Amino acid sequence: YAPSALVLTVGQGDKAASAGVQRAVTLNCMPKPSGTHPDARGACDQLRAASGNFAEITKIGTACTKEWNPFVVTAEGVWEGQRVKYEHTFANPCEMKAGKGTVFEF
Amino acid sequence: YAPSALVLTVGQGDKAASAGVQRAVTLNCMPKPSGTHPDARGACDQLRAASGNFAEITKIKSGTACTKEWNPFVVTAEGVWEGQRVKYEHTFANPCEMKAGKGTVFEF
């Protein structure tokens, strides 16, 4: 196997570079799930099912207003030996609530 | 202040973008040290003493005496330190230089 180790963050703002990070968790998946992530096994399972594609997890029955109150989630590190650097901006808390899945529920 | 959560990697090559990862570990320092890093307390302590400055970890040491052949390794750190983004890489010319400059942080 190849390493799968990530840091994930959430913060206020519309880009990772400009966001005020609120919470950040570690996640290791190979060969066993661990980390400060609150559900390392569920997160590793969901990521495996998506082939490591964070965008598949965050994409938009969700009835949210068009208020702009943005939050950015990030993932960076290595997935099955490949370097990854991901960010996604949710327009507001309502969209984030629907789009976090297990991976970004922290 | 604020979260300090990191992933560190080592790989063969001369820049992170061109080097395949061999091993990677997690490190979280607050409120207590943990992670897959084999000495999380030592790594967190060294980083705290350096105020999160990864260049201070890998800086040159007067006792280092290595031959000069090119056989490079790249180490990286990513994540947050005191809530602020970390994106760091350093290339060691050969195994001797990596042994001299890895400290506890990159000892995995």
From Swiss-Prot, chain B:
GO CC field: extracellular region
The UniProt similarity line reads: Belongs to the protease inhibitor I16 (SSI) family.
Task: Please tell me where this protein is predominantly located.
Answer: secreted
Q: How does it assemble?
A: Homodimer.
The residues of the intact protein that this chain contains are 41 to 148 of 148
- Cell location: Secreted
Site (Reactive bond) found at K68, E69
- Please give one Gene Ontology molecular function term for this protein: serine-type endopeptidase inhibitor activity
The protein's superkingdom reads Bacteria
**Record function comment:** Inhibits transglutaminase-activating metalloprotease.
Keywords of the record, alphabetical order, are: Disulfide bond, Protease inhibitor, Secreted, Serine protease inhibitor, Signal
What species was this sequence derived from? Streptomyces mobaraensis (Streptoverticillium mobaraense)
Q: Does the entry annotate any disulfide bonds, and if so which pairs?
A: C29-C44, C66-C96
Q: What is this protein called?
A: Transglutaminase-activating metalloprotease inhibitor
